[PDB]
Design a protein around this ligand. Sequence first.
Ligand SMILES: [K+]
Ligand SMILES: [K+]
Ligand SMILES: [K+]
Ligand SMILES: [K+]
Ligand SMILES: [K+]
Ligand SMILES: [K+]
Ligand SMILES: [K+]
Ligand SMILES: [Mg+2]
Ligand SMILES: [Mg+2]
Ligand SMILES: [Mg+2]
Ligand SMILES: [Mg+2]
Ligand SMILES: [Mg+2]
Ligand SMILES: [Mg+2]
Ligand SMILES: [Mg+2]
Ligand SMILES: [Mg+2]
Ligand SMILES: [Mg+2]
Ligand SMILES: [Mg+2]
Ligand SMILES: [Mg+2]
Ligand SMILES: [Mg+2]
Ligand SMILES: [Mg+2]
Ligand SMILES: [Mg+2]
Ligand SMILES: [Mg+2]
Ligand SMILES: [Mg+2]
Ligand SMILES: [Mg+2]
Ligand SMILES: [Mg+2]
Ligand SMILES: [Mg+2]
Ligand SMILES: [Mg+2]
Ligand SMILES: [Mg+2]
Ligand SMILES: [Mg+2]
Ligand SMILES: [Mg+2]
Ligand SMILES: [Mg+2]
Ligand SMILES: [Mg+2]
Ligand SMILES: [Mg+2]
Ligand SMILES: [Mg+2]
Ligand SMILES: [Mg+2]
Ligand SMILES: [Mg+2]
Ligand SMILES: [Mg+2]
Ligand SMILES: [Mg+2]
Ligand SMILES: [Mg+2]
Ligand SMILES: [Mg+2]
Ligand SMILES: [Mg+2]
Ligand SMILES: [Mg+2]
Ligand SMILES: [Mg+2]
Ligand SMILES: [Mg+2]
Ligand SMILES: [Mg+2]
Ligand SMILES: [Mg+2]
Ligand SMILES: [Mg+2]
Ligand SMILES: [Mg+2]
Ligand code: NA
Ligand code: NA
Ligand code: NA
Ligand code: NA
Ligand code: NA
Ligand code: NA
Ligand code: NA
Ligand code: NA
Ligand code: NA
Lengths: 187, 72, 262
Amino acid sequence: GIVRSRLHKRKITGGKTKIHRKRMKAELGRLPANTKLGPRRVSPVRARGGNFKLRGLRLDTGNFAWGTEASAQRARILDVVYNATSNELVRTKTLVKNCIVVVDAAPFRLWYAKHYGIDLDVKKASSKLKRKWEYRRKHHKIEKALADQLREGRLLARITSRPGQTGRADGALLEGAELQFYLKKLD
Amino acid sequence: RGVVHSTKMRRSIVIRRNYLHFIRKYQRYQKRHRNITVHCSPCFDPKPGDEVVVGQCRPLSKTIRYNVLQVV
Amino acid sequence: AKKHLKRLYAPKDWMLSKLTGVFAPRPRAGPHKLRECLSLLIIIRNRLKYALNALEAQMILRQGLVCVDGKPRKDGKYPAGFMDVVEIPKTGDRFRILYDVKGRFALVRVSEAESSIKMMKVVNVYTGTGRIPVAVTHDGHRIRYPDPRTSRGDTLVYDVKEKKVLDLIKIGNGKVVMVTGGANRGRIGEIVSIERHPGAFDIARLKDASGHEFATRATNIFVIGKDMSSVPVTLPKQQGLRINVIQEREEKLIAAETRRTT
RNA sequence: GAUCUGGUUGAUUCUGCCAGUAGUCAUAUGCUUGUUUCAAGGACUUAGCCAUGCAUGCCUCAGAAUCACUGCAUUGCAGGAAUCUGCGCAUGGCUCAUUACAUCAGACGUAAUCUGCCGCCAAAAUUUUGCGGCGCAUUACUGGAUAACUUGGCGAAACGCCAAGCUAAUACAUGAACCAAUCGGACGCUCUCUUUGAUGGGACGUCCAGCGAAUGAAUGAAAUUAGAACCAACGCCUCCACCCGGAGGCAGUAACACUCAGACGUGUUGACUCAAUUCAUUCCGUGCGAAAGCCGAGCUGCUCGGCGUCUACUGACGAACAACUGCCCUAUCAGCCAGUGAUGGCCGUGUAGUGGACUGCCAUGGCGUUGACGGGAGCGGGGGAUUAGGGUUCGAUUCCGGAGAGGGAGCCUGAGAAAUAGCUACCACUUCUACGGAGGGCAGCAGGCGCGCAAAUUGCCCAAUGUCGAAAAAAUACGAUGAGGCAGCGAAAAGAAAUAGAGCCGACCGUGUGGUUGUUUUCAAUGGGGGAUACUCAAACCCAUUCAAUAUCGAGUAACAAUUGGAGGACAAGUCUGGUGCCAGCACCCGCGGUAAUUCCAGCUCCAAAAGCGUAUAUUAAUGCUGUUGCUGUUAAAGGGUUCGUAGU
RNA sequence: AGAUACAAGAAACACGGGAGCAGUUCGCAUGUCAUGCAUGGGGGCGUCCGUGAAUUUACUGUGACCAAAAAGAUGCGACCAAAGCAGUCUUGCCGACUUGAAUUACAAAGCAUGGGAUAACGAAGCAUCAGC
RNA sequence: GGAAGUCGGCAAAAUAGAUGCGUAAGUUCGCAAGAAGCAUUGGCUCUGAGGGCAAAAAUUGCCAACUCAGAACUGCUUACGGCGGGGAAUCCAACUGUAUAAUU
Ligand SMILES: [K+]
Ligand SMILES: [K+]
Ligand SMILES: [K+]
Ligand SMILES: [K+]
Ligand SMILES: [K+]
Ligand SMILES: [K+]
Ligand SMILES: [K+]
Ligand SMILES: [Mg+2]
Ligand SMILES: [Mg+2]
Ligand SMILES: [Mg+2]
Ligand SMILES: [Mg+2]
Ligand SMILES: [Mg+2]
Ligand SMILES: [Mg+2]
Ligand SMILES: [Mg+2]
Ligand SMILES: [Mg+2]
Ligand SMILES: [Mg+2]
Ligand SMILES: [Mg+2]
Ligand SMILES: [Mg+2]
Ligand SMILES: [Mg+2]
Ligand SMILES: [Mg+2]
Ligand SMILES: [Mg+2]
Ligand SMILES: [Mg+2]
Ligand SMILES: [Mg+2]
Ligand SMILES: [Mg+2]
Ligand SMILES: [Mg+2]
Ligand SMILES: [Mg+2]
Ligand SMILES: [Mg+2]
Ligand SMILES: [Mg+2]
Ligand SMILES: [Mg+2]
Ligand SMILES: [Mg+2]
Ligand SMILES: [Mg+2]
Ligand SMILES: [Mg+2]
Ligand SMILES: [Mg+2]
Ligand SMILES: [Mg+2]
Ligand SMILES: [Mg+2]
Ligand SMILES: [Mg+2]
Ligand SMILES: [Mg+2]
Ligand SMILES: [Mg+2]
Ligand SMILES: [Mg+2]
Ligand SMILES: [Mg+2]
Ligand SMILES: [Mg+2]
Ligand SMILES: [Mg+2]
Ligand SMILES: [Mg+2]
Ligand SMILES: [Mg+2]
Ligand SMILES: [Mg+2]
Ligand SMILES: [Mg+2]
Ligand SMILES: [Mg+2]
Ligand SMILES: [Mg+2]
Ligand code: NA
Ligand code: NA
Ligand code: NA
Ligand code: NA
Ligand code: NA
Ligand code: NA
Ligand code: NA
Ligand code: NA
Ligand code: NA
């Protein structure tokens, strides 16, 4: 079937290589998963040496990391907004690595309230937790773009896992100059 | 080590190695050469005629197996 | 993959005649490399002469009756190698596998007290799951708590009955080593200096007991003690002293001629 | 052996070829052949086609017997056909069609990866069971199935098949609390204490906290300068005997608010985003049993040994990629590569993993007279032949590497295959049939047809060398193996070696009492052969020993009979005798043959080398006639019509 | 001892997580709720950072790394030999601590000497010169 | 079925637009050439490239015109008009042109 060898390629001199020997199982390729967005569906693949790869088909949730706070939450993906390969992938709603998506922001809002006491149930807390909140808020600063998105209800993130190889859709929230770079494109 | 031959591609250059080959029957030498394509970082700025030192790395493209380590 | 081994492809030091069969027993995976080992069938049949065929050796082996590291082995393809102690309790034989001054294998008799110790060379040190440091050995052992100053090139003395490390000898100038491979195998000398050459092979320069200098790759040396009187194992007859080929032939001719007078 | 000889002229000295000569594990054919040792043997042409038979299976004390099986006992002990289960069949054997940035060799890499069996090791996650209805404990006596079997059978058959009824597990599926440790993250309408509500200190309770995997954060050291002063709270030392409260200063000082006053402040490498640790959110079958396992011993209730298996980790045996240098002839092959990847870049996908390997976008690059691109012959190497030296030539073939199983494509299972005595389809051939259908793959061993100048038995055996495996050998009780070995056939080639020895007499020889030829003779020896108390051998054969140890056959024309080529020259050996008459024929070359042939056809003599010797084709030396060492160029073949001039030297 | 020349295998800084106890040379103390059963000039070692106007190949000497078979070679009266790696004798309930030595293998690659013949670089001389 | 019809393929049939690839002998080197030959073509929803004018300028704002190149989905009864059949040879005249108004 599909092969990954250099036998069918031209030489740097431009000449054609005469092929002897047949195709070996050690150099096979496989058809891409083309992961879409929807209720979860997976397909096991038996790889070399035993072991199973998971093919992602229609994933819809994952773990997304707030890098600045060194935390993560389980959130639901809402849509795909950008892709550096082609607009065709954005149109067809395909989840691949480095895709830019948006998430529901509900888990991150809840975590912020229970960690800093700021709501974008808080008033019913123990006195020692209230004292701990004051310390944490003493020298912590959030940024413009993140605070605006959390109030709105969605924020942008990029996929960090490879959905077609592990069957998981994990990512990290966008921050810093990266957030500005992609906001200007999404206009 | 080699001599810079062309710097047309993006972040890539071609170096040329010149060596002498010994023919046993005639007890004499003849000249040969070989061209190699390597990857060059922006921290270096070689020009044709320069001398470079390269080191082996994992396959980076169809024909690239070396990286520039020092420009003299 | 491969399961056979032709006689012409077998190691030269097994001393197998080319006119007796096509095949040789190939060693299995285990403690020692394929090209640097001596299988149990070769020792029992060809060296000690206790068996006449492979069938008779299988009678001896598949009963116990032969221990290689304090444990009986029932496999005739078990690879036995450098610094191993072969015991046959029924006949009361205890041997250690060393290298001759000509680079060939040599079985030297050892006492009961000495037969329980072994010297092993470290080849790698890494960290296990519970933050446990473990050292890997040329024989293939994995020791789970070596001394915190154990390094990659040195050696440690081991008790095979009670699995504990006796002591550790580090590699440095002025120590006694044995060459374990390549054109100098079986020689014993003192370390004079080591040239580094990062990214390539180190070179060790050694001096013989008679004052002759020779060099080899640093991966071929095996530390056996800080000085010749503190070596904890018995050495072969020649004590790793290579002599001139012209002189050696003369002595061999002088002998066996005085024997014919007597 | 650092060697040459015949042919151009009436004679001479040259250039130059033709012919002669020696070898070849180098093939074939002709004549001949007594003994013994050692050996290659359908590669060349047709990777052409195949009748038949055989080539891969495995059981121990230790996975599962109610054979309606057998032998002894008499409700048991043994052996156990058949089936299920576990492992192997990706090795070995065969062949050389394809093949020049390929394969291979020498040197290096994988920090870019996978790895069953083997070695040394590791393991503290999990609310189960019984009884009474959540409580109490002598808390591990768990579940359905399915084969062999019998009961009907279908079909012409088919290494074809259906349904019903039984019953096992180390097959399959569920499942285990206390015993039983340290270690740290979030909390609370809960208590208690100290200060003036405290990022205050201790308990109490309520969710997480095992290996492996995914994402994000931190750690994964430092190595370019010396003294002071204030304010915050942190640690210590002094007072005013302590307490109360209310004063003033850095002597010492790895860290750490108790039960642990040193229970990692230190991984590795040339180098790491690697090893490993902590924190946050996860894992739905696509992972994690103490096999809910099996044998020996000893003392229902216990103790000790030998095995077997799941998961995690890294050594060995390997696999797969990458490429620094090298490898025949050809220019009457000079330009090659890009739609549809050509050279490089960016984000991805796919893979066990790197990569234009592949999708999208961007730039115009990459290679070449130091011979690219195209064509011809060809599996690569270790090595063989010929040896003054330098060289020329061969290498299908025992060892190593690669590839293939009629052609060509696709794939399942597996740790490993793009497997072919595995599967699927097409093409070309091809077998049986009741005409519905079902089969095939000798470039494995033996054998057959065809092809050709050209190549062996449809043999015996696992005794040796090894491989697989539940496996030592033996005992109620014997694994397989055309891999391998042994013999048969065999003037490919190689080694040793018979076909006579010693004398008397008589007659002769040529030198001048010795050297030898002949026929009547004598007198010892020995094998080729015939056999054995026997040796060898898995058995048989060959070799070797012997022809009395009381007791063993044999040579005289020793018919037990040497051949193949030659006798003008090269080139060793006749000016012999008949026949033929430019005929027949010989002759590698020069030449011979028309009546006296040194050459034809024969007889007799003689020569070479000999159990061997001619002939054909290819190749090495002869050949300084391919010349680097080492040729020639006025007239023998050969200096460009002359200047300029780039690459090269 | 400094300067003159020479030494980046050098000079000048620094690192206790640096030298198995911080290398070589001119019973008393600390601690004691402790297994505190503890602890007490100049020159070479290791590891980093600034300093060159830095020196390199070919060649040659010596060594490393390089399957066997085959080829060259030591030893042994397989009756000799082509072979083989065996075998010998103090008459052995054995011994010789038995033997099986040691070589060559282009071209490329890798370590440490030598600097005569060469080769790769640089420069084209006011595009220069800063004295401690 | 495919020239068997006929003096004779007369008459009819037949090719056909555009785009991508490709193209022989001969030759006065200009040609031959649209030589020969193969493929695509609808509809619908989208994406990219190709510009002007203003401003205290790899920036921001405003705006026009219709070409070219791609992708997903979906369909066919091959469906207006208009629009070369091609090749291998022989004879004659070099070629464009003129020329028997009413049979050449
Ligand atoms: K990439
Ligand atoms: K398997
Ligand atoms: K056997
Ligand atoms: K006559
Ligand atoms: K000549
Ligand atoms: K034409
Ligand atoms: K016209
Ligand atoms: Mg004349
Ligand atoms: Mg049994
Ligand atoms: Mg089975
Ligand atoms: Mg094979
Ligand atoms: Mg190699
Ligand atoms: Mg538990
Ligand atoms: Mg600590
Ligand atoms: Mg061929
Ligand atoms: Mg070959
Ligand atoms: Mg052939
Ligand atoms: Mg042969
Ligand atoms: Mg053959
Ligand atoms: Mg194959
Ligand atoms: Mg065939
Ligand atoms: Mg196949
Ligand atoms: Mg077959
Ligand atoms: Mg056959
Ligand atoms: Mg048995
Ligand atoms: Mg049996
Ligand atoms: Mg055979
Ligand atoms: Mg013979
Ligand atoms: Mg005869
Ligand atoms: Mg006889
Ligand atoms: Mg005659
Ligand atoms: Mg003659
Ligand atoms: Mg003569
Ligand atoms: Mg001849
Ligand atoms: Mg005559
Ligand atoms: Mg010749
Ligand atoms: Mg000559
Ligand atoms: Mg002339
Ligand atoms: Mg002239
Ligand atoms: Mg040899
Ligand atoms: Mg007609
Ligand atoms: Mg008609
Ligand atoms: Mg018409
Ligand atoms: Mg043309
Ligand atoms: Mg056209
Ligand atoms: Mg005209
Ligand atoms: Mg006209
Ligand atoms: Mg008219
Ligand atoms: Na003449
Ligand atoms: Na005989
Ligand atoms: Na005979
Ligand atoms: Na296992
Ligand atoms: Na060849
Ligand atoms: Na092979
Ligand atoms: Na087939
Ligand atoms: Na023959
Ligand atoms: Na010659």
